[PDB]
Design a protein around this ligand. Structure first.
Ligand SMILES: N[C@H](Cc1c[nH]c[nH+]1)C(=O)O
Ligand SMILES: [Hg+2]
Ligand SMILES: [Zn+2]
Length: 258
C-alpha cells in the first residue's frame, strides 16, 4: 500500500512504485571523509534566516513538517555550491528508536541520533512544484543531531508535538526561529542528489554540515512519542523514519574545508 517505514512498506519496497529509487543520484549516502576532496572554488556558504516566517507544524504520517511562508525572499540559502537564491519552504527530521541510529547520511559509516533537513527551492523556477522538475531545483541543508545537552532553540518544537501526536493534525507554529538549530560551524560536504522520501526526486544539491548539534535524551524522546497512525487507530510509534545509505555511483562529494 502507501509507502512507509516497515518490513512491508519500507525503503526496500519503494522502487516498485517509485523506480527512481535505483536511480543515478539517490540519497542519502555515506560520506567517506578520506575520499571527498576539498574544493577551493566553493564560495562561502550563506544562510540568512533573519526574517524567517514559520506558519505551521504538521504531522504528515511519517514525520512532522514546520512549514514556512515562502511567498517572498525571507529565509534564503545561497553561496557554497549554489548558484542563485533558494527559499526555505520547510524543515523536518529523521530519527531512530535508539540513539544509535536515525540519521540518513552517515559519516565514515557512523550513524547519528537524528538528522534535520531544511528544504529550499531555487527561486529561478517560480515555485516548489516547478523546481522539482529541475536538476538544480532544490537545496537541502542537512544537520546531524547527537544526544547530549539540550538544544534551547528546539524546545518550542518539542513542546508542540503533543498537539500533533497523530497523522493529519497540524498546530499553529508561528514565529519559530530556525537559527536556533544551526551548529556553530558551517563547514560542509556537498554532493548532487535527491529527496529521501517518495517520489525521491533527484533534484537536490546536498549541503551536509560536519558539525552536529546536540539535543537532550528527553528531547529526542518526545520525538519518539509521535505516531505514524491517524487518531483513533492502532498506535505505531513514529520511529526509524530514515532511509539507509544508497549507492554513490558516479558522483563525487566535495568538502568545503581542508
Ligand atoms: N513524504 C512525501 C511528501 C513530502 C515531501 N516532502 C515532505 N514530505 C510523500 O508522501 O510522497
Ligand atoms: Hg529533478
Ligand atoms: Zn529528509
Amino acid at each position: 500500500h502507501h509507502w512507509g517505514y516497515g518490513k512491508h512498506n519500507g525503503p526496500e519496497h519503494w522502487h516498485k512504485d517509485f523506480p527512481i529509487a535505483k536511480g543515478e543520484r539517490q540519497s542519502p549516502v555515506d560520506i567517506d571523509t578520506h575520499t571527498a576532496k576539498y574544493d577551493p572554488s566553493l564560495k562561502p556558504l550563506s544562510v540568512s534566516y533573519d526574517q524567517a516566517t514559520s506558519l505551521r507544524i504538521l504531522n504528515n504520517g511519517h514525520a512532522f513538517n514546520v512549514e514556512f511562508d515562502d511567498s517572498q525572499d525571507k529565509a534564503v540559502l545561497k553561496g557554497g555550491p549554489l548558484d542563485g537564491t533558494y527559499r526555505l519552504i520547510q524543515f523536518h527530521f529523521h530519527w531512530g528508536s535508539l540513539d544509535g541510529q536515525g540519521s540518513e547520511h552517515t559519516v565514515d559509516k557512523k550513524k547519528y541520533a537524528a538528522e534535520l533537513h531544511l528544504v529550499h527551492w531555487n527561486t529561478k523556477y517560480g515555485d516548489f512544484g516547478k523546481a522539482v522538475q529541475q536538476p538544480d531545483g532544490l537545496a537541502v541543508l542537512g544537520i546531524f543531531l547527537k544526544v547530549g545537552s539540550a538544544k534551547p532553540g528546539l524546545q518550542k518544537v518539542v513542546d508542540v508535538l503533543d498537539s500533533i501526536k497523530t497523522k493529519g493534525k497540524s498546530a499553529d507554529f508561528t514565529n519559530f526561529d530556525p537559527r536556533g538549530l544551526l551548529p556553530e560551524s558551517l563547514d560542509y560536504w556537498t554532493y548532487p542528489g535527491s529527496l529521501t522520501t517518495p517520489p525521491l526526486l533527484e533534484c537536490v544539491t546536498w549541503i551536509v554540515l560536519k558539525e552536529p548539534i546536540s539535543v537532550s535524551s528527553e528531547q529526542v524522546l518526545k520525538f519518539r512519542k509521535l505516531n505514524f497512525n491517524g487518531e483513533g487507530e492502532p498506535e505505531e510509534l513514529m520511529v526509524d523514519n530514515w532511509r539507509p545509505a544508497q549507492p554513490l555511483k558516479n558522483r563525487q562529494i566535495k568538502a568545503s574545508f581542508k
